[PDB]
RNA sequence: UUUUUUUUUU
RNA sequence: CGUAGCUGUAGAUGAAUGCUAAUUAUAGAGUAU
RNA sequence: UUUUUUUUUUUUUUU
RNA sequence: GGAAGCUGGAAGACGGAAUCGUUAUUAAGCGCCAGGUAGUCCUGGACACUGAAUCC
């Protein structure tokens, strides 16, 4: 490990690498491994130059919690994948709580529900439940050792929106009603100035009263008590209503308090801001075609704000966009929240590192022949790219 | 060639004699046969200048027990042109047409172009397709792998002489750029 | 007003402000220099060329 | 001012029917060269424009059911040519016009320029002490190459900007615009 | 300067305590040092250039001079009274040594070649904050007087040659360091600059006219 | 030819715009101009009001 | 592969806006100019009263409404068959632009007096 | 985040940074004028110039600034105060446009144009008000404490605008009422909103019952640094019971909680600046503590000159004598001080001392002056410390300067009255004729004369004399005498009032001629 | 049709109001035209270059069309102006009869048949579009 | 075969 | 430019495009279900 | 081009 | 007369038989306009790309 080991292919066993990834592996690549014929062969991966500088990071923000360190999350753009199969294993095993998800497209492009609420955002209680799931399955013994927090109760509406931000929805019904009601007192000058201002005095005493009435939020009465953050069995057990109310108050709970380093991961990042395949009547005259922006939905919009990241007082951030499921273009990165000095720009492999994954594919008995005449020839062919090489190579025998 | 570039380099190195447009050239035949395929497998170069050398493996591990104090002349190097006097001289036009072709009365093309065709072996006349010159890293690409190289060298506790270098190439203005968010970090270490 | 700011105060008074009244300069040179043309209903005729 | 203006260019250009009308008019315009005044004659550039053809067709004997077809082709040629510093007027328009032969008409076209403000300043320099405390070739423009550079820009500016605007405005069934009634 | 890797006194150690205060005012974070430090260091190096030799091509050249100067105009300290530095450099051997060494455009080709191989000046970059410096030195206002007049007019005859072809940032700094009460009279007369200074105007009209001497005027800073 | 317009305002103003636009066209004659507008306002003043 | 704007991505059908950030296309043009007809009539100051009945927004929505939306946009892409070659239809939104303007039509986004512009 | 910054050092030392960013500002596009902006607010120097050309182009390039981007080139204009007559009519020109319903902007706005001049009514006041007093049914519980001291601030208020803020208190703070819930959530929405609100001399009969505290027993509210809010907020009229329950607490009276050099001196002196409260006889126990902390030479560099100036006022609160504690025991050779970042801090410290020492017995009565001896010591400080200040004159900003002027013009009158060595070199070069940014003034809406007003050069940096009124309007104890040639009345607290409204008086009198002025325009404490 | 006619009279383009002798355009910019006294006079105070094509040949039955062109063009960069005004002149024209790559302006006029009369209308123009450019 | 922006979410 | 490569849907037993209460465009006039 | 791009190709032309 | 939305249960998976001919940028597919002096064709004229096989 070191500079001086750069471009090596590093040994993972089968059983273990499963245990480590229960979710399955980071980007494409199991449509590579299918391709060994050896069921005992062991997997590897290419330690690339943008994981090193990016582990350095890592290291120097462990050792300061025990303003140097970086506090925000980055972003792989231009193999931004590849380098997601050998970061996330290494930090799960030291001891970190890493928040596994390369593909979050599928709680939006899949069966599913919605039900239409007053704050705007739709839910999805048939997706809502396989989040937590997924997410415990490697993550256990950890979450329920954490402490839970006071100050951050029940302030959390039924969709996960805000007490503050959600009896916003209701200024407009409730402006109307004390216009109509004023007429009591309106009808009963006096110096033409106490006057006025003594009947404007009743507007606000009534507007605090009716702030504090009407408005019911549901305050998780079912736990009275709380003493852990995994102890929220309940969720699980009713889905029809308590289904996004407990996903939203794990996400604030792990912003306050700091006990343990984390991580969030997410994988495919630019396939979350284009239109569903949901259909709805929410659309601006032609702007969709009848259909739900991705963005709009409960648990997309969860992962689809990275001007937060500063709230993670525990760890950070980070997201690579690296498939063909929509054409970049200009992909301006600055209407998006990350900033120039946060974008990781890689480029293709250099001759080196080529001729190492070429060797890599012949252990595993995949190419038939691959004469050292014609290494140098495919080079050009393929120009180098990841996805062209494997392709070119599977396709004909190889050299 | 590979196996003269190298050597040339750290001959000036030694001197104190460099040159502000012969880095430049040299600087490219380190980087290209850096990368190459044929880096760890290929022997020694035949000048006998290796043999008596603590490092080995030709110029795959050659380059990485490089002193420290050569390292940041890679990073640190002016890449500037002659025409470059818009900072301290003062104004100065730049020329992009150098070529100027006017045709005359003694080279101009027949009326009847038709036959002029049919009097040649092979077709000389093509519409106008020129294709221009591309720059390529110049050296930048090997520059962003030995600045690494620096930031590892702080927390040794080292002498004093050996850890200027390491600052000489976090200074830089036009190679490292801002890339990365690694030069504030490498700086406050 | 003060010494300077005298017709800015006035200007805003009057309704003026500094986006509409902006493109209403540049309208009126450009109608001047230009025909008289804004595609009004009757226009059209005029247009074609005598055959 | 009008007597401030000059001749900067005089793009002449020619349309001929024949192969041998056009030849003639080149060999005239040679012989009027070589004779005036200046030792050096104004010697303008080549610049030819390709050579248009149209052909229709027809339908060939009548009573028949279109077996055959007989084309009738109709060539025709051009040629341009390129003036820098015309000082002689005289020497140079008649010799343009009197190079005409037969069927081949012209199409010239003028380039004037006025000076601004003429830039007169740098007076004697100042001066103290310390205080002790030709090449002229036979077929070519005898013009300034870098006058010709200067103008040759100016040329290829309004064609691009001509070409662009006369696009817009091209559409059928002209004062035509959409929902105007 | 190019200190890069003593002959009678004071010739080598001079360059390295020159450069030295240069960097510490070249901060931009916070205050560079205390003024009693700046007093000391300025002392430390006022006695020991008087003693520089008062020759050769060992004399010390304005690109390396102008280094030091250049700090100054930025981190809001005044230069000291003390013009002893000034006295052992540029116009004692930098100019009188050029001229012995071997028409109206004939001018404008001597000065042209002092930056040509040996560039004892970095063209109109070190050049010119010394007419700057030169101007605010004594910033309050009612032989250092003598020696201040005959500077400024001296530095001042080999740029006017040559403006016209200069970077137009250039050309206002030198302009402005003209027309100020510190500058010595008889130079704006109708002889060199009264008629240039239009021409700058007219290619420039964006900028302002009358309050020409509203930078550095006879309001000194 | 601006000499004499309908009295009625809606007419006034259909018949004097084609004047300004008339004269910055190109394709109709100076004859026809002066005869297209002669024969429009008459035609217009024979008719009832446009309100 | 079959993308809308072809190779260079062309857009002649959409117009920006110079406050806020919203863009339609033309046929939601004609939709919002008769549903904001409230303020338009107000601003100047029955045969004028004519298009009262076209403000309704349910109305738009059926048979009857439909078909008069679509009778105004008389779909300018569409044009006589020896439109071709150099003959080809322009971006109309010169037209729609003044139109959108004069008429001091509010956003929907931010309540702003004529702002529009073509892009 | 990592903050870092590059110097453009291609040459190492070529070209002039100041001119460099001068031209290229004439002509640039809208998103470079704001990024050039900033870089002047973090740098050393300031050049006076270069300001107005800023403003200046600013109302021509307000055709495409979003905004958001008004908002933000406005908030940069919160340090040192400056601002041009143009630049007026510029946000005057937009405002009306951004009242898109913000509910933050009603801070944001109101807070950055507290400073320079606004008020203005029929452009900015009317919209202002008119929308600020019917939204306040949203209003959160951070935004309203922020607005008590935005009001405080102001000058000639309404009746409809301070009642509104009022009743929004009463109706919040009830909703809290029913440790750390109560000791600072509960009490520190209370003292500090009542010290806003007491400024315009205003209160009601539901707010004086709820604020005190209604059971005598609730001890333990605030540190010895925050109870002076509620003292501060009576002794205005008829204000009383507040104070202490009956005059006997246990942390507010035996030398409060613990006063000690660990970070506390500092503190307490700085809330006694802004805060308007006389030393009682158990507040000049402070004044001791600083016999024994100058001693430490830690205390002597590091908070001594700061402390000297930000409690300059008052003299018989902070230091047993005007000349004792004021000499130098020990400053001859630690006089330097980070250039001139503190050093300057002393000038302005002997200055108004000097005031104190003739207006003591001379026609002003409440006190008698020293022995003689004591003027001989004072000039022996102030004849060291200004020569100092010769080389470091370029290292002040703006604001640094602005009130140099004020400190600097005194020496000249008392001097000449019938002394300092160097006052006829660098009092009589720039510190007499100064040319720096000036700003507007602070002036109210009451006289409703905004058409024609002008501005004329004096000590005040700018003032409001039109051509037309040009000389004509603003140019028994306590109203005799101290409504005369004092015209300073003992609210606010006069130290500094009676200084600067001297010499304004005088400053227009020797160049302009303007007779008859009415000064009145008093602001709140 | 009628459908169509309503919508113009809600964006405000109809005549419909809820003798005259008026002074035509044309008229107008005449009366305000500063002609020079005469030859020895510059009219103008900047570069300007002028371009029309001339038909020359034998004798032909009938004149050809497409001959009485006439345009004027000028650099931006060499003309100098103010930031404001320099703004408002390329506004006025649009982007179409400006050159991003040499900045150069290009005014054409052709609305008469003869090449005199066509001739003089560009410079009655001319001088009118710098009165309003300063502004 | 379909992208965000002028700001009111701990 | 079209079949592109690439990549989502149903690895269509069910992709045939004419019939018409109804409008788009040229024209002086192409209308009635 | 390790602060560079972010991508299919036509039937006349850089004389 | 041309095109378009909506609506859609017009008639067809028959026949490996037989008649029209191609001398390879041939054959087989797909895409564009020039003229026909308002619109107005599946034919004719005319250009370009992919482009296999046989004993001819």
């Given amino acids: 490990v070191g500079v001086e080991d750069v471009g090596r292919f590093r040994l993972f066993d089968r059983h273990r690498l499963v245990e480590l990834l229960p979710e399955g592996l980071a980007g494409e690549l199991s449509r590579d491994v299918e391709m060994i014929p050896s069921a005992t062969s062991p997997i590897g991966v290419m330690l690339r130059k943008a994981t090193l500088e990016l582990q350095m990071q ?200 700091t006990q343990l380093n984390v991580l969030i991961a997410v994988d495919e990042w630019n396939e979350c801001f284009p239109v569903s395949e949901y259909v709805s009547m929410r659309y601006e005259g032609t702007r969709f075609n009848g259909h739900i922006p991705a963005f709009h939905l409960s648990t997309p919009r969860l992962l689809s704000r990275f001007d937060d990241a500063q709230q993670f007082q525990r760890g950070l951030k980070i997201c690579a966009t690296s498939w063909r499921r929509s054409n970049r273009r200009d992909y301006r990165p600055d209407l998006l929240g990350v900033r120039q000095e946060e974008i990781r720009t890689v480029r293709n492999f250099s001759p080196l590192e080529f001729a190492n994954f070429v060797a890599y594919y012949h252990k595993k008995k995949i190419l038939h022949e691959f004469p050292r005449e014609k290494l140098d020839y495919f080079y050009m062919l393929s120009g180098g790219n990841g996805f062209q090489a494997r392709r070119l190579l599977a396709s004909l025998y190889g050299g | 060639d590979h196996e003269d570039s190298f050597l040339v380099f750290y001959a000036m190195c030694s001197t104190n004699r460099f040159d502000a447009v012969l880095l430049p050239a040299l600087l490219e035949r380190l980087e290209a046969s850096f990368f190459s395929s044929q880096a760890l497998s290929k022997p020694l170069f035949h000048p006998i200048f290796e043999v008596w050398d603590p490092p080995c493996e030709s110029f795959a591990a050659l380059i990485n027990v490089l002193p420290l104090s050569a390292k940041a002349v890679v990073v640190t190097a002016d890449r500037r042109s002659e025409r470059e006097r818009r900072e301290n001289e003062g104004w100065l036009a730049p020329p992009e047409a150098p070529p100027l072709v006017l045709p005359n009365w003694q080279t101009m093309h027949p009326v009847d172009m038709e036959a002029w065709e049919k009097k040649q072996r092979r077709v000389v006349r093509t519409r106008h397709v020129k294709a221009k010159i591309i720059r390529q890293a110049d050296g930048r690409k090997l520059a962003a792998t030995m600045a690494l190289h620096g930031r590892q060298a702080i927390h040794r506790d080292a002498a004093v002489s050996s850890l200027v270098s390491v600052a000489a190439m976090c200074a830089s203005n036009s190679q490292r750029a801002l890339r990365g968010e690694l030069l504030p970090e490498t700086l406050n270490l | 007003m003060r010494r300077l700011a005298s017709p800015s105060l006035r200007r805003l008074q009057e309704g003026q402000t500094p986006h509409s009244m902006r493109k209403s300069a540049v309208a009126d040179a450009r109608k001047k220099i230009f025909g008289y043309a804004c595609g009004m209903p009757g226009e059209e005729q005029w247009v074609r060329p005598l055959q | 001012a009008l007597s401030a203006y000059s001749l900067r260019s005089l793009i002449v250009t020619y349309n001929s029917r024949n192969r041998s009308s056009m030849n003639a008019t080149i060999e005239n315009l040679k012989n009027a060269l070589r004779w005036t005044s200046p030792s050096e004659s104004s010697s303008p550039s080549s610049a030819p424009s390709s050579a248009p053809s149209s052909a229709p067709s027809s339908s060939w004997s009548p009573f028949k059911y279109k077996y055959a077809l007989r084309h009738y082709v109709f060539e025709d040629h051009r040629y341009a040519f390129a003036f820098y510093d015309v000082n002689s007027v005289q020497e140079v328009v008649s010799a343009a016009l009197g190079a005409m032969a037969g069927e081949t008409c012209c199409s010239c076209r003028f380039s004037w320029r006025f000076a601004g403000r003429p830039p007169v300043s740098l007076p004697t320099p100042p001066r103290l002490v310390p205080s002790s405390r030709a090449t002229v070739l036979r077929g070519h423009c005898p013009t300034d190459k870098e006058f010709i550079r200067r103008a040759l820009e100016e040329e290829q500016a309004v064609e691009r900007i001509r070409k662009k605007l006369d696009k817009k405005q091209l559409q059928w069934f002209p004062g035509k615009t959409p929902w105007a009634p | 300067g190019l200190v890069q890797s003593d002959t009678e006194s004071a010739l080598w150690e001079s360059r390295v305590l020159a450069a030295l205060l240069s960097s510490f005012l070249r901060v931009d974070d916070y205050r560079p040092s205390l003024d009693f430090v700046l007093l000391l260091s300025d002392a430390l190096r006022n006695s020991l250039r ?52 071997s028409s109206s455009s004939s001018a404008e080709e001597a000065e042209q070649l002092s930056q040509s191989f040996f560039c004892s000046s970095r063209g109109r970059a070190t050049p010119g904050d010394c007419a700057t410096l030169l101007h605010s030195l004594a910033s309050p206002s009612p032989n250092l007087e003598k020696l201040r007049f005959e500077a400024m007019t001296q530095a001042w005859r080999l740029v006017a040659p040559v403006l016209h072809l200069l970077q137009p940032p250039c050309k206002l700094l030198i302009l402005n360091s003209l027309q100020t009460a510190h500058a010595p009279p008889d130079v704006s007369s109708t002889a060199f600059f009264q008629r240039s200074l239009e021409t700058f105007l007219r290619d420039n009209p964006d900028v302002d006219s009358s309050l020409l001497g509203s930078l550095f005027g006879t309001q000194g800073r | 030819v601006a000499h004499s317009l309908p009295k009625d305002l809606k007419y006034r103003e259909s018949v004097a715009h084609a004047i300004r636009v008339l004269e910055r066209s190109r394709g109709w004659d100076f004859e026809s101009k002066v005869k297209a507008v002669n024969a429009l306002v008459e035609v217009w003043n024979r008719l009832a009001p446009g309100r | 592969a079959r993308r809308v704007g072809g190779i260079g991505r062309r857009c002649f059908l959409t117009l920006h806006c110079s406050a806020c950030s919203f863009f339609f296309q033309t046929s939601d043009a004609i939709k919002l100019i008769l549903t904001q007809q409230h303020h338009i009539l107000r601003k100047k100051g029955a045969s004028k009263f004519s298009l009262l009945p076209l403000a309704d927004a349910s109305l738009l929505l059926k048979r009857r409404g439909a078909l008069v939306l679509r009778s105004l946009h008389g779909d300018p892409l569409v044009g006589s068959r020896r439109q071709r070659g150099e003959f080809a239809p322009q971006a109309p939104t010169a037209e729609m632009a003044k139109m959108l303007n004069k008429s001091c039509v509010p956003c929907p986004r931010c309540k702003r007096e004529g702002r529009w512009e073509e892009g | ?370 022995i003689a001896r004591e003027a001989e010591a004072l000039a022996k400080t102030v004849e060291r410390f200004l020569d100092l200040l010769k080389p470091q004159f370029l290292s002040l900003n703006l604001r640094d300067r602005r009130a140099l002027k004020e400190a600097a013009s005194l020496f000249l009158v008392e001097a000449k009255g019938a002394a300092l060595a160097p006052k006829t070199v660098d009092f009589c070069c720039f510190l007499e004729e100064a040319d720096v940014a000036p700003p507007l003034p602070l002036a109210p809406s009451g006289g409703v004369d905004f058409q024609s007003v002008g501005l004329v050069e004096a000590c005040s940096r700018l003032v409001l004399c039109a051509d037309a009124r040009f000389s004509e309007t603003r140019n028994e104890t306590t109203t005799c005498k101290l409504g005369g040639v004092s015209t300073d009345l003992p609210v606010s607290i006069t130290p500094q009032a009676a200084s600067s409204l001297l010499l304004t008086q005088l400053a227009l009198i020797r160049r302009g001629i303007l007779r008859h002025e009415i000064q009145t325009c008093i602001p709140p404490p | 049709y009628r459908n169509k006619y309503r919508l113009r009279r809600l964006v405000g383009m109809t005549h419909d109001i809820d003798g005259r002798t008026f002074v035509t355009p044309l008229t107008k910019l005449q009366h305000q035209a500063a002609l020079p006294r005469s030859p020895l006079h510059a009219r103008f105070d900047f570069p300007h270059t002028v371009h029309y094509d001339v038909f020359w040949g034998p004798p032909q039955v009938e004149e050809e069309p497409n001959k009485s062109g006439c345009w004027v063009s000028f650099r931006v960069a060499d003309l100098k102006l103010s930031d404001s005004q320099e703004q408002r002149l390329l506004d006025i024209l649009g982007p179409e009869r400006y050159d991003e790559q040499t900045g150069v302006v290009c005014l054409e006029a052709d609305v008469f048949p003869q090449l005199n009369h066509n001739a003089a209308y560009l410079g009655d123009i001319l001088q009118q579009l710098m009165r309003e450019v300063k502004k």
């Fill in chain 8, 1 to 370: 985040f990592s903050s870092l910054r590059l110097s453009q050092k291609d040459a190492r030392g070529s070209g002039y940074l100041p001119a460099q960013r001068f031209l290229s500002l004439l002509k640039a596009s809208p998103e470079e004028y704001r990024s050039l902006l900033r870089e002047a607010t973090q740098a050393k120097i300031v050049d006076p110039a270069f300001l107005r050309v800023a403003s200046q182009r600013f109302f021509a390039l307000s055709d495409r600034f979003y905004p958001p981007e008004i908002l933000d080139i406005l908030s940069d204009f919160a340090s040192f105060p400056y601002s041009d007559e143009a630049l007026l009519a510029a946000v005057a020109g937009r405002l009306e446009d951004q009242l898109v319903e913000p509910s933050p902007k009603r801070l944001a706005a109101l807070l950055s144009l507290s400073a320079r001049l606004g008020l203005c009514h029929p452009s900015i006041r009317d919209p202002l008000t008119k929308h600020i007093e019917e939204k306040m049914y949203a209003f959160d519980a951070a935004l309203l404490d922020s607005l008590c001291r935005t009001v405080g601030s102001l000058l000639s208020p309404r009746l409809p605008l301070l009642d509104g803020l009022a009743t929004q208190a009463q109706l919040l703070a009830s909703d809290l009422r029913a440790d750390e819930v109560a000791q600072r959530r509960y009490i520190a929405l209370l003292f500090r909103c009542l010290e806003g609100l007491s400024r315009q001399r205003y209160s009601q009969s539901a707010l004086v019952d709820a604020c005190v505290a209604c059971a005598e027993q609730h001890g333990q509210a605030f540190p010895l640094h925050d109870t002076l809010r509620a003292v501060a907020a009576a002794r205005r009229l008829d204000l009383a019971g507040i104070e202490e329950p009956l005059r006997r607490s246990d942390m507010a009276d035996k030398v409060n909680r613990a006063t000690d050099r660990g970070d506390q001196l500092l503190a307490l002196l700085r809330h006694l600046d802004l805060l308007r409260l006389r030393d009682s006889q158990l507040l000049q126990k402070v004044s001791e503590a600083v016999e024994l902390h100058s001693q430490k030479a830690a205390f002597l560099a590091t908070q001594l000159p700061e402390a000297l100036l930000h409690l300059t006022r008052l003299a018989p609160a902070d230091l047993r004598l005007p000349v004792a504690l004021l000499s130098q025991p020990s400053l001859l050779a630690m006089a330097p001080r980070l250039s001139a970042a503190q050093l300057q801090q002393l000038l302005s410290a002997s200055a108004l001392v000097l005031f104190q020492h003739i207006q003591r017995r001379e026609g002003g009565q409440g006190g008698d002056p020293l």
């Fill in chain 5, 50 to 101: 008087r003693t520089a030799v008062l020759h050769e091509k060992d004399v010390l050249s304005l690109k390396e001079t102008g280094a030091l100067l250049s700090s100054f105009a930025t981190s809001g300290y005044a230069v000291p009274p003390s013009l002893m530095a000034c006295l052992v450099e540029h116009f004692l051997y930098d100019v009188d040594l050029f001229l012995t060494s």
């Fill in chain 1, 58 to 257: 890592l290291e120097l923000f462990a050792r300061v919690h025990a303003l140097a360190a970086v506090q925000r999350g980055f972003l792989l753009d231009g193999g931004k994948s590849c380098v997601l199969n050998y970061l996330i294993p290494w930090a799960r095993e030291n001891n970190w709580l890493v928040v596994y998800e390369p593909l979050p497209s599928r709680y939006a492009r899949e069966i599913g529900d919605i039900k239409r609420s007053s704050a705007g955002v739709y839910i999805q209680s048939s997706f809502s439940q396989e989040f937590l799931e997924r997410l415990g399955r490697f993550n256990r013994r950890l979450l329920e050792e954490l402490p839970v927090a006071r100050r951050c109760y029940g302030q959390a509406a039924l969709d996960g929106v805000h007490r503050l931000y959600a009896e916003r929805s209701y200024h407009s019904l409730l402006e109307k009603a004390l216009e109509k009601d004023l007429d009591e007192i309106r009808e009963q000058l006096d110096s033409q100035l106490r006057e006025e201002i003594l009947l404007a005095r009743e507007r606000l005493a009534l507007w605090h009263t009716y702030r504090r009435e009407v408005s019911i939020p549901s305050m998780k009465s079912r736990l009275p008590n709380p003493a852990s953050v995994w102890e929220i069995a309940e969720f699980g057990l009713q889905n029809e209503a308590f289904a996004t109310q407990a996903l939203y108050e794990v996400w604030e709970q792990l912003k306050k308090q």
